[PDB]
């Protein structure tokens, strides 16, 4: 489809920042510190995120802002748009199940 | 290219469409009705970019009916229109457009007869009467002389017949065709199609 | 012309009591490389009129030819008549614009001083043809970086004398220098008064770089 | 009028290895365009306590990349317990510079002294390379004294006499490139450490010009 | 063409004595074809409270339906009526985010503060600038004619009635100069004690 | 800009409006769009303005050095044709000319269409110009050849109202001619809005 | 709720997915402006602290849009910055980066450091590789004493004694370069960065209005916003006062409000 | 490339009276965002009963009013009478159109008595069509001070209200408070207001202060 | 946009063509005729950009016929043909090309009737039958189906109503009236016009 | 596969001036994209007995105009029976190079003697503008030996001194220079007249490469 294809360049980059700071931050560690620097914060964000809400509704995500220290940072992210006041929900079960991979 | 006409009265929306679906020179289809039902009382004149106008058309249908299905209502003509706007903005802002010109024609038994006016661009507003297509440049002259608030049915359809005399006469395409309906309180009505032979 | 090659940097002229004065560096850039660093962007038309431009130096020196090549020849006339400073204005602002016309202008922005009759004559006349008179006048980078200092000054005291004119064109080059890379440390002062025209030999400035240390 | 310019360094940038220990040396000019943004700047961003960097490029993406190899170079030290060595900071300024080579562009030399190989000189250009050279210039002045590094370079020239040489060889860029110029930052890395002086006015070498009289 | 362009509009807001006013154009016409003489830029954003978009007629009703959305959630969880300041506060955040691909329109907010009853009139930019004058704001196709006319004829401490008329004047000589706007004019005058909502007669032209 | 004429039996209805537009500004209200060559032959402006008034004027000029010459009025046919000619000669440098030559001469009323790309055309029933379709219309439902004087001005003044109603460029007043075998003559100038007031 | 078919949750942050409807309305005819402050922002460092400076007019095409607009944004109680280019990408900058330093200010408990600011600033900018237009001129007095920095777009800085920015520059600049002493006093410096300003009003079409200054030290911050209004109106000659019933209304619908 | 044309700003205005013809314009002469003087009015008198402004591209105008000043004195030559303000109108159409797929950049605004003694004002754009007109403004600032002129002189959209006849001093008042609005809201005005009164006894300047950048 | 057809018979070339002149969207004239009388026996069906038709096929006609005068007698249909085809290709080739499609029909009383294809490139080409315009596609098909080289007259205009049905069918553009004239050994005679209301 | 590129010089010209006479020199590479078309080519075209002239750019522009002043001077000597001056031709070519500047890009720089003014040195870059310099270098090759003749040039240098200093200028510019290449021509003009010499091989100076073990 067309729209894979980014319609601003700068679109792909700001779309995924935190996956791309995440990213570097993990490159940083393996290249100083190692393996298991990488390893030890990908385990705890999986294990962090692993417990919220359901997807219809908005979490907090209070100790994944801690690991990750964005705790006490706020960008554009944060206040441009309110995940909260999605405007646009659909049905409860269908979002589990898109969650948990079945559809 | 395609044309879409319609006239609002006291308690009835006459709305007509021609029926030539044609790719490059040749008329491929003389019969092709545009018209999409939305519900027993709300009637969709989708005219556009080939693909665009079915698929986006059978959505709305479908939705106004999976409405109809949960609530056990039909949706007002209103919240039709709104809804089709919302939906058009939202797609055509993404990434795959609907270059769809839109002429939403329903009767509501408490706000009665409703004419709504959209363009590709999803700007909806209600009109007594409005057309599409390179038609309405020639036909929205006669409506603005001949229309009254006050129109009786036989007048509206006069007046129709006009627009489609004129569309002959000046209109560079054929179109010898028009699939002509109108919605009252009792449902959408098939009227004889107006030809020109 | 369609390519500028070697371009001029500025001219900055301001009229004062007695006559005006003009200034332009002696610098002749190709392209940020400054290549020729001892060429003259003024010439002298007559006893009461100067001229300096900033541009394309093959044009300056077509001008120059064409100018002194009337001159010469409504000396050789002797009938008593001088070319004004303003009639050299005008003609060069209809050479301009025919230019211009033709799709092919001279590139130079051109400045041009004089003194005749006792009134201090200061011009402008651009690329398309843009003519005017001002007090003060400053061309390429000097209309951004010298022309307020002058426009200040002249607003402030209306009237200056040549050792206030020429102060503060100094100071005005010097700015130049220190904020347009095309510019260049030697400058050539003319003045131009009830005496003749009077072109000064190459003049430097006085820089100054605490600021560097200051960090 | 004059904007929508990246801030581009624009500078000549120069390092020299003596007998243990490196020589660095740049202008101090910034041109956006052709305005001078800042005519005092620091070309020479420390990397770490004996380690040294050269930008030449876009301002923003050398700075960038300067901070960023800062930040590993200090982590890595850190961790290693070790004073970092010279060919590390190359690597990483290489990894960075190849890795984004179609998205910034930063042409910068590393040197600096570590305990292993003493003084040592790395050039990084836009690309994404590295290889050690005895002595590297770059920027856009670089191309005026290639001529003149070639021919007036030796082996085993002391600390003073590398001091010299880069201040003539800038000197000369600054002269001939219209990006280059302010003054010239010079800082002598050893085992000692970092010795920085600044050279102003008269200090800055000066070359005598032509002045043929006819021009 | 530029797409302001491509749907017209105009709307005005002026600021008196203890009173505020805004006024818009009443044409919807795609291009050169007008479609409807009375469509809809004025919204009301509370009691003493209206914003008037102008621009893209679908950008102009997507961001007044996006607004109410807000305004509503807003009024529900503070239980509150907004502040003019935090209306503007709100558009403009609205419309940075959508900053690199823009709603084309530049609302302009007219209210009286709900507890002090002081006028308020502000500007927003096509990314949401706040822009906040005593004097009076104006956004359209048409803005060097409105600018013109509100110079020539705005005074301070404006009587309702005859800001009303200035505010009118104004609007109805700048659209008579542009084609794309025009075809009646919609004047509401907001006071603590009422709301005058006029229509005035222009030319249909 | 639109433009109305029409060919009736008691002689041709030339009818306009005075709206100049400059881009989304109007640049005026008044100007007289149609361009009088002689005292029995007029024509119209449609489209570029100073090009139609430059040319319409040479078309005069030049009729009036025929009429000089051979002693005898030009027809319409002929000063369409040198109009044409004219136009033509200078294909493809970006005139925009749109007008029609509206004169009575031995054969009868006249009407021409002619405009910049070259084509020249003789009919009943014309109208040029952006608002031209919705005039085109009105007439055309209300067009009749066996029409009285009043009611052919009627319908010029409604189908040129409506244009303007409709059109964004169009406005200002109808500048309503009508073409008789003595000469043109000036029916009336009716403001727009009066126009409105009247019929609604 | 939603209509059928919402399977990922609502993606928070910036909405690019408009750019489609850009492209499409220029294919069809050849984009509208936005305002860009034309603006002369410029600050000194003298021996006290740091002194801005700003105009109060703001440009929207070639039309003055804010004939009083304050150019000169609050970071922290000791920094202070100056907005160029692009009126509304200044102003969210300047508030995101305030907010930052709030939040870190109110962690740390103590006063902000300029550097942290200079950093954060570049850092975003670099991020966003210039696309927000955020000429900025950056003055505080922390602990380590005044610093003053020229924040570009791009997200290139520099520290330097005096700094200007905008499309006015130029001429501010060239009054520093002209009249700048190592050490100023604050009356001298007040003077200084007003003329600057003024230059770049009275020479530059973008840039107009009054003037705006800010004085920081390490004992006060004093902000003055109408430091000078060197133009103003003239005085209107005839009167254009309308009297009631000069317009025509067509509809009266009188609405009242309950207090 | 190379650009024949720039835009040195400038705003003409021109009042038709009784026995007055008022033509004024600024004299702001600005390229980019730079000013080039304050001192350029844009309004050259032809005539004694004819002034004529000039806005747009500077060397254009120079060259169009010196074209026009060598034309009005050829014809004073054939014919041996000064030309009339309709005359100059129709020649100055002539010449704008000559010169048509080369166009001048100029707007030009004719303002004098014509052979009655009323004033006259001829609008003309930068191909050559034009008008005669009671009021008309050019220049930049033309779109805000339209408006204006229609409502005050015109007293459109004004119902209930006396046509009082245009005084010399009430359009004066006029001109004044449309040029001051001008240059508070155009970049292009301001510094000076010169104004050109063409009455029956001559030609009569006056030039009134605006507000600098 | 504008078609022409020709059929040649044994003893008679039959011609026709639309009526319809259109600018933009609107048929500014519906009895435009397109056919230019060369001489007493030759007729040119020219189609093509706006004024290069009219301005081609008159100059050709005031060619041919002061050809006439000076001579006493006419050009062969072939010669006119010969003439046009090096006068188009000259324009073409200079800096003023002439956007003209011909079809060129004639009687002579040695060769007989000769009908002539040209495209706006000026290659000659001759052909029992040929058309132009967007509607040849659709009627060459019906033209070699039903074409017979000892064609009755009857039977051609037969052949050439079955060719306007097929264009009324299937073409975009309304055509409702040809202007149908034929080429015979007495002259050019102009037969009732092919209607269709 | 590598056609369609114009033939150009590509060449590093240099003409100094000594007393007595000028020395010219210039390298022997014609470079059709980077194919070396011609290696030993002769750069140094004789304009009149005792006037030369330094090709750089297109070498048909070039040669077209050398042919063509050539064919006017020896027309204009015969005529005034005199031998021709060297700022006669140097005038010749800046006329030609000024009138067909947009059509022919031809950078000339023409150096000889003549009795009057004795040895003179004239460029002529693209653009057509004329100046007398004591020592003018000019072609691709030029930007990279900038610094070293400013640095190296003397006041009062003798023919063999010349000769040297512009053997090692021209040989720096062939090592730095790509476009340049091949062999050094040199041509010592003075009142005696005019002595040509090739320097190849083991002749051109060599200057020693960093050769930094390492790499």
Known sequence: KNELLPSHPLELSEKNFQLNQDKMNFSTLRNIQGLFAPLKLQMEFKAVQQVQRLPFLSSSNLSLDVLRGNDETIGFEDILNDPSQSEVMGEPHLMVEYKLGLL | ?197 | TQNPMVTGTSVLGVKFEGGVVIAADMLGSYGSLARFRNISRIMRVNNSTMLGASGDYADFQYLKQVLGQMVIDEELLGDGHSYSPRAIHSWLTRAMYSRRSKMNPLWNTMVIGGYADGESFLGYVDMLGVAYEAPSLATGYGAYLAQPLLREVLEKQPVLSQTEARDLVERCMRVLYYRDARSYNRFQIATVTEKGVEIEGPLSTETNWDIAHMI | DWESREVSTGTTIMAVQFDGGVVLGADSRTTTGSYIANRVTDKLTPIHDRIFCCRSGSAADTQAVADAVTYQLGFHSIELNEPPLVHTAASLFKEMCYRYREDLMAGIIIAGWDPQEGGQVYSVPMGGMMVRQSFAIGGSGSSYIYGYVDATYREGMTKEECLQFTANALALAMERDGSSGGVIRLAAIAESGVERQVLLGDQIPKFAVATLPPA | MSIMSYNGGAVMAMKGKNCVAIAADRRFGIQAQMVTTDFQKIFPMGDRLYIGLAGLATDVQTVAQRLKFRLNLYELKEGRQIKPYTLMSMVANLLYEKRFGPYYTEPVIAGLDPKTFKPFICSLDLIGCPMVTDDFVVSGTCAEQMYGMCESLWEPNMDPDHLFETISQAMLNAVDRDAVSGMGVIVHIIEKDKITTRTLKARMD | TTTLAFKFRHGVIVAADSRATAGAYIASQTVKKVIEINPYLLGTMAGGAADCSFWERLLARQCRIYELRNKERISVAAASKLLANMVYQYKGMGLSMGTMICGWDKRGPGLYYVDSEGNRISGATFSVGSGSVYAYGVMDRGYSYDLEVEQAYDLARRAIYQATYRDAYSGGAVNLYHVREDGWIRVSSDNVADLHEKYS | MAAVSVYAPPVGGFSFDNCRRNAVLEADFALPKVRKTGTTIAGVVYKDGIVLGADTRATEGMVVADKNCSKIHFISPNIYCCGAGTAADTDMTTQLISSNLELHSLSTGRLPRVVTANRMLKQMLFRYQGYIGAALVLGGVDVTGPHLYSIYPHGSTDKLPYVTMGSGSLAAMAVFEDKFRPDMEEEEAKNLVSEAIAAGIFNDLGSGSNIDLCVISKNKLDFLRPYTVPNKKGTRLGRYRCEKGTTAVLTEKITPLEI | RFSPYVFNGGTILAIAGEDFAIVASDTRLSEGFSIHTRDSPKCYKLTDKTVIGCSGFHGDCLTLTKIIEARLKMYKHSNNKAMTTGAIAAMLSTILYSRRFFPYYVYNIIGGLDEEGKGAVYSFDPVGSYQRDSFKAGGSASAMLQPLLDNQVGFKNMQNVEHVPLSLDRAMRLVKDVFISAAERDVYTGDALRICIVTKEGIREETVSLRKD
Do not use: W
Request: with cysteine; glycine share 6%.
């Open chain 2, 1 to 197: 290219m395609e044309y879409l006409i319609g006239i609002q009265g006291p308690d009835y929306v006459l709305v007509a469409s021609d029926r030539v679906a044609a790719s490059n020179i040749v008329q491929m289809k003389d019969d092709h009705d545009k018209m999409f039902k939305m519900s027993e009382k709300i009637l969709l004149l989708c005219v556009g970019e080939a693909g665009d106008t079915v698929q986006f058309a059978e959505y709305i249908q479908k939705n106004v009916q999976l409405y109809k299905m949960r609530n056990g209502y039909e949706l007002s003509p209103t919240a039709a229109a709104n809804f089709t706007r919302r939906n058009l903005a939202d797609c055509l802002r993404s990434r795959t457009p609907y270059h769809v010109n839109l002429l939403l024609a329903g009767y509501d038994e408490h706000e009665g007869p409703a004419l709504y006016y959209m363009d590709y661009l999803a700007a909806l507003a209600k009109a007594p009467f409005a057309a599409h297509g390179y038609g309405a440049f020639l036909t929205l002259s006669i409506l603005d002389r001949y229309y009254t608030p006050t129109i009786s049915r036989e007048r509206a359809v006069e007046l129709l017949r006009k627009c489609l005399e004129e569309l002959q006469k000046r209109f560079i395409l054929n179109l010898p065709t028009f699939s002509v309906r109108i919605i009252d309180k009792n449902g959408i009505h098939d009227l004889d199609n107006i030809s020109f032979p």
